[PDB]
From a paper:
Further classifications and reconstructions gave two maps with distinct features in an interior tunnel, representing the CCAN complex alone (apo-CCAN) and CCAN in complex with a fragment of DNA (CCAN-DNA). The built model was then docked into the EM map of CCAN–DNA complex at 3.7 Å and further refined. The structure of CCAN–DNA complex was built into the cryo-EM map at 3.7 Å resolution in which a DNA double helix about 25 bp in length is clearly resolved. Around the DNA is a positively charged channel composed by CENP-LN, CENP-HIKhead, CENP-TW, which is complement to the negative charge of DNA gyre. CCAN complex binds to double-strand DNA through the electrostatic interaction between a set of positively charged residues from several CCAN components and the negatively charged phosphate backbone of DNA, which supports the previous reports that functional kinetochore assembly is independent of DNA sequence. The duplex DNA is topologically entrapped by human CCAN. In our CCAN–DNA structure, CENP-LN coordinates to form a closed channel with positive charge to encompass a double-strand DNA which is similar to CENP-LN interaction with unwrapped DNA in yeast CCAN-CENP-ANuc. Compared to the structure of S. cerevisiae CCAN-CENP-ANuc complex, both human and yeast CCAN complex bind DNA at the same positively charged grooves assembled by the coordination of CENP-LN sub-complex. However, human CENP-LN has a narrower opening, probably caused by the shorter CENP-NCter which leads to the formation of a more compact conformation of the human CCAN complex further strengthened by the interaction with CENP-M. Therefore, human CCAN adopts a close ‘b’ shaped conformation to grip double strand DNA, while yeast CCAN forms a more open structure to accommodate CENP-ANuc.
Author numbering:
A (entry chain N): 116 to 211
B (entry chain T): 458 to 556
C (entry chain K): 163 to 191, 205 to 223, 230 to 268
D (entry chain Q): 77 to 124, 130 to 165
E (entry chain H): 204 to 241
F (entry chain L): 25 to 105, 116 to 143, 152 to 344
G (entry chain W): 14 to 88
H (entry chain U): 249 to 314
DNA sequence: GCGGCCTCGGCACCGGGATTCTCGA
DNA sequence: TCGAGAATCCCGGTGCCGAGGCCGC
């Protein structure tokens, strides 16, 4: 995806807040509907804004799992609107 | 005063809410409008060779502003915007005593 | 039929006065006497028209029956006149 | 496509402008040729974009140059990736 | 089709003995023709 | 006869004498006469917000232009407090020949951007025709779909000029379950959408909603399990279909769905809500779905 | 607003330029000129607002309006 | 396709105008107008080539995606 | 016919002399005027020469006069400051002739 | 060179709505000047908005964007 | 701190992307 | 058998009316 505006923001909770504006080589990067990816820094779990689920989603996971030195990216199939609750669930951080 | 009259009339002429900061700049627009007009009436009345500014001295100017045409003459333009007691002074009515 | 004759005589009252009192107005310097100019407007509105004078002359007169509300200018092409549609 | 061929014949009329600038000595004769050009209108338009055509086509040609660059880059980096 | 002319010529008497130099009601002819009954 | 017949009807209705309406499965309603294919097809997949409309006094299906102007000049005046109003008789949205012909009210904005598209229909509503006098052209159903603001303006105009009153038709979960059952009993093919039942549990602090969406062919085979008498569906058959849903949901999630209330029953025939924004008309059964809807509107009027 | 100030336009025509002889109702013509100039301002500023799709007229639309209409209204 | 028939009609139109021509300078003006019409037909052929290049881009908008 | 032979012949004359002007002004800023560019600027000269003729006639009518003199075109030059300054010196050069 | 005398007589007199109005050679050569600077001004405004876009060609659209201030100004 | 004013936002109806599955290289 | 085109299931990304806030009397 040669024309993308990837903008990171290392938050203070130690979780890089990637934002990706997509666009193929034929088009300019589209900032109308970006795909924010909240990758917790050294965590195997990397939240993702389920914007459109295009052909970039298997490239979103692929780039995520190759940037962080992992090998397999799996959609957990956890899909919630409350990221502050997904953070609790996937980390078991809510009852502790 | 009169500039405040026109900015208030702007409200009922733009049919849409604006900002006061827009109004003091349209005040400079009216000030420059006169800064072009009163010396445009100056030069047009001098072009006619007359010291005073007769109504036809301004009809030519409004022809310059493209608002008087062969379709829209001077007097018809008075119909559409000026009130009756004011156009009674401008466009000649008839009583066998046309104004 | 009685209402027909009554309305007809009311018409010959109004129009007789339109001949008489309009000599208090009375024509002056083709122009077209305001009786004739008015009745040319009135004939046109009777069957519809928006032109009705195609800018009849003596401009003091054409704008006379415009300020009092007798006639109306065409809202788009203001060289043609209509008689305000009192119908 | 009526307005498009009206722009065609305005280019025709610009060329007419040019010839009349160069000719100017055939006034009745180019009256005749403007006559045959007007019935040429009546023969083509009656029977039957361009600035967007030319400009957008040049823009899209630069776009296809950019696309060939995209294929050069992506395909070659795919050759290197699958070479790995 | 005649009263519709009699409601047109009538209302151009309410608009001609108004806009002109009328001296409308200080006259005994017009006073019965002006104030035209509907 | 002119009123006392309606009083006796009110007596019969309030008596509540053994109601269970064994209803005929909505029969394939071959589009009667004209039924403008473009218009009706435009009117199908639109989410009509139902209302109950009392009979219109002094209405006539000849003076459509006069009402169109009278309402157009009223809507744009409510903007003073760009729009065209096209009253259009539908010519075929009627159950029997004696029903009043359904007519539309469309807020057409330049192009044909139909903002509101009202719809009054009276199909198989001969429980109201035989009780009201001739002066009233009764159309119990009113169909909105435009914004609620424009509906609450055209409704006011209709109250002002026709003495008709719009109660927002609310299909109770009982009637909702009924229609959810007779629509999976239909003889259709190529099911457009899954048979979804949007439940909504009555919890006081929270408002959990359930979408018990069944595969449309799978619900037809489940309906055939509880369908024994053909031609007409009974209240017990409807309740057994709904209880097979209950015993497939409480079986799975251990929460008694029967303790909840239906709020929306999407079906391949026609979606149907509760709060009013009810009738989507996916298939061309709309003379039967509208038959049920008008029969329900009589219940509210009468 | 249904007014046209007799005094204000005359005072402006005298303050700005001290040497003229504007006729009995010539200031009424000046008011008509300004009325139509502000008409053009209002309409072309509405066009400017739709150009940026701003639902309120602001400074950045009026300044663009001025350089078109004020220059156009020059004799 | 239709461009060849249009060019043939334009040449036939120029030939018919030359059949009714009156002078040698008028023939030169007609030849210049025919060259202008050839330029217009070249613009039409450039529009056809732009359609072909847009088809290539559509293939190029899928090959790159592939 | 006569309207066409009138305005097309002067469209030709305008294009011819304006093309001479195009070669005369293209040498300043090393520019080239394309065929449609010349065709446009010629017809704007034509269309706004209509405007100048509309203005200039009523300019003479304004001074209760039938002929067009230098003050009329000075009022035509009244429009813009930059060409007020340009036309002032070009007008004193007119008076030199 | 310029826009000559027998052509400036003819072009201006075409738009003349009456036959009895003439423009003198003293004013005629100045009319030559004012429309010559019509070409000069339209061309300089076009090439100025061209360097503003940094072009080596004056295209169709540049002239169309210069009319809203060309006809307004000139 | 209220009176007619205004501005976010849940719900919901209408507009393209990828999966079905039919047809051509 | 397979490759591009169309339609349509799945859920957006948008449109648009009540709720909350807010400034004279």
């Amino acid at each position: 995806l040669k024309n993308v505006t990837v903008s990171f923001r290392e938050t203070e909770e130690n979780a890089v807040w990637i934002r990706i504006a997509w666009g193929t080589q034929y088009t300019k990067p589209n900032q109308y509907k970006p795909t924010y990816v909240v990758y917790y820094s050294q965590t195997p779990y990397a939240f993702t804004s389920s914007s459109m689920l295009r052909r970039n989603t298997p490239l979103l996971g692929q780039a995520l799992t190759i940037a962080s030195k992992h090998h397999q990216i799996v959609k957990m199939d956890l899909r919630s609107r409350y990221l502050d609750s997904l953070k609790a669930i996937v980390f078991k951080q809510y009852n502790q | 005063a009169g500039l405040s009259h026109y900015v208030k009339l702007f409200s009922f002429y733009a049919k849409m809410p604006m900002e006061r900061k827009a109004l003091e700049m349209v005040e400079k627009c009216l000030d420059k409008y006169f800064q072009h007009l009163c010396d445009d009436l100056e030069v047009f009345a001098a072009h006619a060779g007359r010291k005073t500014v007769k109504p036809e001295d301004l009809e030519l100017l409004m022809r310059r502003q493209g608002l008087v045409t062969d379709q829209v003459s001077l007097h018809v333009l008075v119909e559409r915007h000026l009130p009756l007691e004011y156009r009674q002074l401008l466009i000649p009515c008839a009583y066998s005593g046309n104004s | 039929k009685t209402k027909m004759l009554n309305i007809k005589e009311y018409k010959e009252k109004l129009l007789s006065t339109l001949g008489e009192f309009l000599e208090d107005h009375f024509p002056l310097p083709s122009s077209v006497n305001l009786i004739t100019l008015h009745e040319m407007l009135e004939i046109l509105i009777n069957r519809l028209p928006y032109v009705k004078i195609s800018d009849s002359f003596w401009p003091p007169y054409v704008e006379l029956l415009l300020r009092n509300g007798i006639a109306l200018r065409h809202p788009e092409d203001p060289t043609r006149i209509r008689l305000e549609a009192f119908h | 496509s009526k307005s498009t061929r009206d722009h065609l014949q305005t280019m025709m009329e610009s060329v007419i402008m040019t010839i009349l600038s160069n000719s100017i000595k055939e006034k009745e004769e180019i009256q005749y040729h403007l006559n045959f050009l007007k019935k040429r209108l009546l023969q083509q338009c009656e029977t039957l974009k361009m600035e967007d055509l030319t400009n957008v086509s040049s823009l899209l040609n630069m776009e296809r140059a950019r696309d060939k660059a995209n294929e050069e880059g992506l395909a070659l980096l795919q050759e290197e990736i699958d070479k790995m | 089709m005649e009263i519709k002319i009699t409601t047109v010529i009538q209302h151009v008497f309410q608009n001609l003995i108004l806009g002109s130099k009328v001296n409308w009601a200080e006259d005994p002819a017009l006073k019965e023709i002006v104030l035209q009954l509907e | 006869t002119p009123l006392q017949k309606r009083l006796e009807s009110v007596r019969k209705q309030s008596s509540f004498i053994l109601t269970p309406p064994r209803r005929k499965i909505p029969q394939c309603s071959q589009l009667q006469e004209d039924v403008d294919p473009q218009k009706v097809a435009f009117l199908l997949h639109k989410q009509w917000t139902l209302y109950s409309l009392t009979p219109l006094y002094k209405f006539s299906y000849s003076n459509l232009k006069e009402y169109s102007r009278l309402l157009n000049a009223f809507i744009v005046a409510e903007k003073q407090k760009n729009i065209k109003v096209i009253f259009s008789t539908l010519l075929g949205m009627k159950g029997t020949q004696r029903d009043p012909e359904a007519f539309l009210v469309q807020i057409v904005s330049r192009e044909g951007k139909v903002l509101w598209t009202g719809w009054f229909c009276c199909v198989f509503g001969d429980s109201l025709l035989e009780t009201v006098s001739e002066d009233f052209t009764c159309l119990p159903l009113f169909l909105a779909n435009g914004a609620e603001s424009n509906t609450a303006i055209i409704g006011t105009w209709f109250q002002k000029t026709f003495d008709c009153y719009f109660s927002p038709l609310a299909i109770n979960a009982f009637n909702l379950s009924w229609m959810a059952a007779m629509w999976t009993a239909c003889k259709m093919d190529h099911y457009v959408a899954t048979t979804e039942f949007l439940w909504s549990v009555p919890c006081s602090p929270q408002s959990l909603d359930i979408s018990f969406a069944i595969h449309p062919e799978d619900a037809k085979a489940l309906w055939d399990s509880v369908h024994k008498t053909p031609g007409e569906v009974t209240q017990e058959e409807v309740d057994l279909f709904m209880d097979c849903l209950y015993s497939h949901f409480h079986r799975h999630f251990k929460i008694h769905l029967s303790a909840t209330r239906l709020v929306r029953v999407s079906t391949s025939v026609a979606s149907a809500h509760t709060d009013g924004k009810i009738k989507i008309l996916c298939h061309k059964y709309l003379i039967g779905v509208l038959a049920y809807l008008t029969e329900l509107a009589i219940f509210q009027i009468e | 607003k249904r007014k046209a100030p007799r005094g204000f336009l005359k005072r402006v025509f005298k303050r700005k330029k001290p040497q003229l002889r504007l006729e009995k109702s010539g200031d009424l013509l000046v008011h008509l000129n300004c009325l139509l100039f502000v008409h053009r301002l209002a309409e072309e500023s509405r066009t400017n607002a739709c150009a940026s799709k701003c639902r309120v007229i602001n400074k950045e639309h009026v300044l663009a309006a001025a350089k078109v209409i004020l220059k156009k209204s020059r004799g | 396709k239709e461009l060849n028939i249009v060019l043939p009609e334009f040449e036939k139109t120029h030939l018919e105008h030359q059949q009714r021509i009156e002078s040698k300078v008028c023939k030169a003006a007609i030849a210049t107008f025919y060259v202008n019409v050839k330029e217009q037909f070249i613009k039409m052929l450039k529009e056809s080539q732009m359609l072909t290049n847009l088809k290539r881009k559509n293939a190029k908008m899928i090959s790159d995606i592939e | 016919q006569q309207r066409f032979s009138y305005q097309q012949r002067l469209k030709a004359a305008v294009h011819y002399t304006v093309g001479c002007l195009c070669e005369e002004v293209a040498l300043d800023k090393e520019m080239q005027f394309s065929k449609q560019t010349i065709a446009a600027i010629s017809e704007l000269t034509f269309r706004q020469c209509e405007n100048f003729a509309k203005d200039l006639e009523m300019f003479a009518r304004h001074a209760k006069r039938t002929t067009i003199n230098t003050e009329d075109v000075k009022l035509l030059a009244r429009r813009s400051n930059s060409l007020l300054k340009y036309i002032t010196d070009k007008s004193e050069e007119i008076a030199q002739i | 060179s310029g826009f000559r005398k027998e052509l400036v007589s003819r072009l201006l007199h075409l738009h003349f709505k009456d036959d009895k109005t003439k423009v003198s050679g003293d004013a005629l050569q100045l009319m030559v000047e004012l429309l010559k600077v019509f070409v000069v001004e339209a061309a300089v405004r076009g090439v100025r908005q061209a360097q503003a876009e940094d072009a080596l060609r004056v295209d169709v659209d540049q002239l169309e964007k210069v009319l809203p201030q060309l006809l307004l100004d000139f």
